[PDB]
Amino acid sequence: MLLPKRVKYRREHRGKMRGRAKGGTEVHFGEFGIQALEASWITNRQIEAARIAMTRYMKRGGKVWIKIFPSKPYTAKPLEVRMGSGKGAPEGWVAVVKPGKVLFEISGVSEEVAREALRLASHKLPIKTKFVKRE
Amino acid sequence: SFDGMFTYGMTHELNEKIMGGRITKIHQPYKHDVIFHIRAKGKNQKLLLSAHPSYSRVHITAQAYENPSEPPMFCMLLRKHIEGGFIEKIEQAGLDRIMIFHIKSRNEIGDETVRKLYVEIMGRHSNIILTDAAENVIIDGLKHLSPSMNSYRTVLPGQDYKLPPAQDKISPDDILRHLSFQEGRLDKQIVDHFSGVSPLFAKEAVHRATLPKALLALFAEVKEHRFIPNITTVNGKEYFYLLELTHLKGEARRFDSLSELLDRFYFGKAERDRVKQQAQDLERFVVNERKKNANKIKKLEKTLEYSENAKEFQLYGELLTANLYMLKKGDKQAEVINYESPTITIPLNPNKTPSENAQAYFTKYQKAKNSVAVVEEQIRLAQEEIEYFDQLIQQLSSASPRDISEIREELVEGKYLRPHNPVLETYESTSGLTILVGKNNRQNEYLTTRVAARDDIWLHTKDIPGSHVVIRSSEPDEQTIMEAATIAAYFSKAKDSSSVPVDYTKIRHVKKPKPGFVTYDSQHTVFVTPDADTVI
Amino acid sequence: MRLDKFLKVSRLIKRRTLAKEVADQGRISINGNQAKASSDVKPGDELTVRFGQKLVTVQVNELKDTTKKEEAANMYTILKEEK
RNA sequence: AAGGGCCAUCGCUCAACGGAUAAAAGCUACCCCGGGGAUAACAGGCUUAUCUCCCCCAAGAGUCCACAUCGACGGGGAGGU
RNA sequence: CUGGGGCGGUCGCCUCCUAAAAGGUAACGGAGGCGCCCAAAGGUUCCCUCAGAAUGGUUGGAAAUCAUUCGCAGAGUGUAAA
RNA sequence: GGGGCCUUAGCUCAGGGGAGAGCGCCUGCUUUGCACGCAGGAGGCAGCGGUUCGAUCCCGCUAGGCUCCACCA
Predict the structure, then answer these.
(1) Which candidate, B360, B361, B357, places its Cα nearest to that of B332?
(2) How open is the CA angle A76-A80-A84, to the nearest 5 degrees?
(3) In angstroms, rounded to a whole number, what is the distance separating the alpha carbons of residues B45 and B427?
(4) Which residue ranges does the record annotate as region NFACT-N domain (chain B)?
């Protein structure tokens, strides 16, 4: 459950996930990676689920290199409450994702193993994905 | 110790020096303790006073201990009315444990004035008071005492001073007159006739066996200042008095000055007893833990005696796998032979197959095996801890404060407790050699590892628990080999045990495997015994 | 302040409980008047007290609450004792 | 002359800060009038966070065996009680 | 005022974001400040340039002050922010 | 859940410039003396963050506790 240690503002606007990514569109730390085909917010619980999934499938395998970090916080008012009276309290932390963006990489491991692990992770994630490799 | 006799001796023997002593400086180092640097007889001298209840006394010390950074209220009040004083006279207060200084000094206008400083040393309720000469009014007081104690006298300033009720005791045959010697335990009731008495003095005089002679002779002795200031030590419990020891087995060390006697007594006892309190408070806790671990393993052992059906199930599974062809699925029993050719009737589950049943027996064997392994590991843990604490208590018995300070940190590191090169201690040895040791486990390990080589020799117990000690590259003669055995037997699980074998082994085989779980090989062993301080 | 608090801080009596007890017995008084633990006091007050037969008369100079030990007795002065 | 005017200046958390008076708190279930669906309680409606139900990946439990039956961390939907 | 009212909270002024590249722009939207201070902390003339880092060096110490080269600026700008 | 108060040694307390006053329980010492003591159990700002050369002392966020409120259909 990743966390930014320190932040300026505990409360931010949400934002808009228009367009494609700026960077991180291609694997370069590792060999076999995964990228997105949509745009969405992703949570520390999602990423750690995917991470531990692939690492359990691999059991010693090489290196991973996540390519993101949930910097963004997201609020949520308490339950059964009218509107207004200030912005809701923070709940967790979020990473924002554009399409064309690489999320997880892999090295030290064969292609079939990598593809299967990333499949497993994709099923923990909400969005549509693609298997990718380095050029 | 501090009887009216000792008091009266001091009264004359300090007026010997401090006729008209010019009080040059005043300080209050500790709570119930006050220092005067006085100039009398053309010389500067120290004068300690103490109303500290058990240690309340008066003294003159070569050790000007420490003048404080803070001048307290009482000190400054003394500075107000006594500073630059002049000790006209000393008085004994009629042989009670009380003293008087008749003092002169000029006031703030240069007009000469006088005062009466009183020092009542009663024991738990001693005190120091300052009083006016003519008015007898108290001006200062160290232990203000309000009459909620509904007592005769009172301390507070301004009030007319008053002395305690002097008891109806003839302060100096008269006991054979007044007291019925049939009463017995008369060491008690000499206090009931005389003023300056200790039960120590009374007992030592009563043990002279009708003995008025002893009383009269000793009174003449004191009156003549014929005493001998020594300190007595009856197996510890170090006592002292004007007279020497009379009968008891205790050691004696004599002095030229009662003041030096007081110095060499109290200079240690100020903190020795504190260290003893700390040591005992810690020892209680350690013994609680060790006793707890012992009872813990007792629980585990007496619990272990009720789940031990492993081998039966093992052998049953063996036999069933051996006889897995004569057996129906649905049967209750099996007359079966062991591979000594007995014939065992093993029960079955009439629903299961023999395969299932035998596998269940193997399963139960596995389970009992597992649980027993668990309990045996817990046993090993607890016994390691118990032996650790037993060695620890041995060390604490044979300890010094310098190693106790390390042991505390060792245990706080072990997290049983909560809140840098000096390692070893040595003395003389045979062949003019030096043999180093450490009563602390940590210091002992530091010496064994970092202070010697592998080919050197370590000498320790050939037995359960003792210290660890050796000379730097211990390769000296058999004289030193046998001398190390004495140092080993001295600091051991059983000090003064005249049958203790010591193990001497090359440091190259010293096993550095809890802490101080050091095994040893390349070892020989020699029966030996404890010794005296000549082991130093 | 209150009498019992005053007695404790001045260390005449070691326990406020005991101060209350004696005031409820009425063994003591103020300015010739019988008093109680809640009785108000001030500087200049003249206080009569009993300890069995020991009767006492004192005078109030000051009053506070932090009252360290030796500074307690500065708070007041003895005047007289009877029995 | 009193007094007033002009000029300069002082006096207000008048703070509810364009300040209603120099001067002011509450109960009403004993209540009343004028109006409102411009605004609340029921129901209806939109939403479906929540709720219920279904499903995906599948580690793991299941002696062995993921999917007999259960199903973690996570994910996606339906319904409109 | 009020996402019914009540209770809570707020009520004037300043700075930023929201604010959509002039300006302006709401919400019980997000962050913070004011109800002053200086008689020199003003005016003018003249002067010079910071913070930190590395070296060496008593007390001096990780950290005073010291010389020392590096050093658009990481400092300062009475106070909050721009 | 909201608001206010509090959260400093074992207990009770004071105190933006360096946390210190008193008291008690258990143990030990202790002794001639009308409960008159001493040492150790031990003496540590609920936590997090920020401003300042500095924070218990100013600010903010959160936890624990006490009190008040949590009403109309």
Answers:
(1) B357
(2) 60
(3) 37
(4) 1-172
Distance CA A13 to C1' E18 in A: 9
**Contact indicator for B34, B48 with CB cutoff of 8 Å:** yes
Torsion of CA B31, B29, B85, B127, to 10 degrees: 20
Distance CA B90, CA A126 (A): 100
Written as six digits, the tokens of B308 are: 């031990």
Inter-chain contact C14–B150, Cβ cutoff 8 Å? Answer: no
3-state SS assignment for residue B303: helix
B148, B154, B155: which to substitute to probe chain C, counting the most C Cβ within 10 Å? B148
DSSP C5-50: HHHHHTTSSS-HHHHHHHHHHT--EETTEE--TT-B--TT-EEEEE
Tokens at B391, concatenated: 């060695």
The side-by-side arrangement of strands in the sheet containing B468-471 is B425-428, B434-438, B468-471, B457-461, B500-506, B523-528
Write down how long chain B is: 536
8 A C-beta contact, residue B214 and residue B19:
no
The pair of structure tokens assigned to A50 is 């995917």
Q: Which chains touch A (3+ CB pairs under 8 A)?
A: none
Alpha-carbon span B503 to B517, nearest angstrom:
16
Does the nearest atom of strand D lie within 7 Å of A128's Cβ?
A: no
Closest CA in chain B for residue C15:
B148
Question: Which technique was the structure solved with, according to the deposited record?
Answer: cryo-EM
> To what resolution in angstroms was this structure determined?
2.9
User: What distance in Å separates the CA atoms of residue B396 and residue B517, rounded to the nearest whole number?
Assistant: 17
C63: which residues sit within 8 A by CB, 6+ positions away? C1, C6, C9, C41, C42, C43, C75
**How many angstroms separate the CA of residue C53 from the nearest CA in chain B?**
9
Which one, of B367, B353, B342, lies nearest residue B320 by Cα?
A: B353
Closest nucleotide C1' to the C-alpha of A56: D59
Give the number of C-alpha atoms closer than 13 A to the C-alpha of residue B521, restricted to the C-beta side: 5
Alpha-carbon distances, residue B237 vs B250, B321, B332, B375, B495 (angstroms): 9, 76, 78, 48, 20
The CA distance from C16 to B130, in Å, is 31
Locate A40 and state its tokens.
């969405």
- The continuous run of DSSP H or E covering B284 comes out as helix B258-304
- B4-160 belongs to CATH 3.40.50.720: no
CA pair distance B377, A109, nearest whole angstrom:
40
**Alpha-carbon span B484 to B265, nearest angstrom:** 33
Q: Which nucleotide is nearest to B169 (CA to C1')?
A: F32
Query: Does the C-beta of B203 come within 7 A of strand F?
Result: no
Spanning CA of A10 to C1' of E38, the rounded length in angstroms is 39
CA B86 to chain CA mean position, Å: 43
Here the tokens at position B221 are 């002795």
Give the nearest partner residue to C77 out of B148, B154, B158, using CB atoms.
B158
